[PDB]
């Protein structure tokens, strides 16, 4: 059990493409794989101000946070993501947007930016 591991013991039969089919059927029934949501550890580039406890996320702070693929698609095709972060003092979720056309973020729902 090495972190860098070259081989993985497989059962003696294991038709691999067959396991791709049966596993492809299995992929629908599970709770986690289908969550439509995501969890990512990240930073806050633009700092923050909370709109509930008026707490300040000072400049760039680690967070365990939540990424979501947005139904928008920038221009004809570019991906655009929406991230959420919980506040340390209060339970509150603040969201982001990533503008590919204007490199900087723009945010909504529960926080304001410092100037």
């Amino acid at each position: 059990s090495e972190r860098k591991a070259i081989n993985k013991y497989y059962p003696p039969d294991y038709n691999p493409l067959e396991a791709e089919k049966l596993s492809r059927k299995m992929a629908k029934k599970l709770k986690t794989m289908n969550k439509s949501h995501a969890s990512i550890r990240l930073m806050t580039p633009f700092s923050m101000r909370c709109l509930e406890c008026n707490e300040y996320i000072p400049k760039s702070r680690k967070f365990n946070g939540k990424k979501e693929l947005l139904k928008e698609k920038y221009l004809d095709s570019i991906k655009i993501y929406r991230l959420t972060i919980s506040c340390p003092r209060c339970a509150n979720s603040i969201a982001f947007r990533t503008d590919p056309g204007n490199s900087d973020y723009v945010m909504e729902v529960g926080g304001v930016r410092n100037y």
């Binding site: 049966l22 596993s23 299995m26």
Partner: protein
């Protein structure tokens, strides 16, 4: 990469697909509802799907009385309760 990735890989799933055919594993801690009740199957199975509801009834039921102060939050959570308890009713009715 968080184990969310590592538990869903093919090499994890395939042995579950063998355990369903060779025995009585396959959890029910994994799958979701299943959405429709009457489409469920032999009683010894819906029996486990039902507890797979009552447990959440217990978790969020405890999560009711907590002072933690979010009233909107406990409102939506309250509706979620009612929804689940109705589901419990449905699983009993099918039985």
């Amino acid at each position: 990469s968080r184990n969310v990735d590592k538990a869903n890989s093919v090499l994890v799933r395939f042995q579950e697909q063998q355990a369903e055919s060779a025995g009585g594993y396959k959890d029910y801690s994994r799958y979701q509802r299943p959405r429709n009740v009457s489409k469920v199957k032999s009683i010894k199975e819906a029996n486990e799907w039902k507890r797979q509801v009552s447990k959440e009834i217990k978790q969020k039921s405890t999560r009711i009385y907590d002072p933690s102060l979010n009233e909107m939050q406990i409102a939506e959570l309250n509706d979620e309760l009612n929804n689940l308890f109705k589901e419990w009713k449905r699983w009993q009715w099918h039985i």
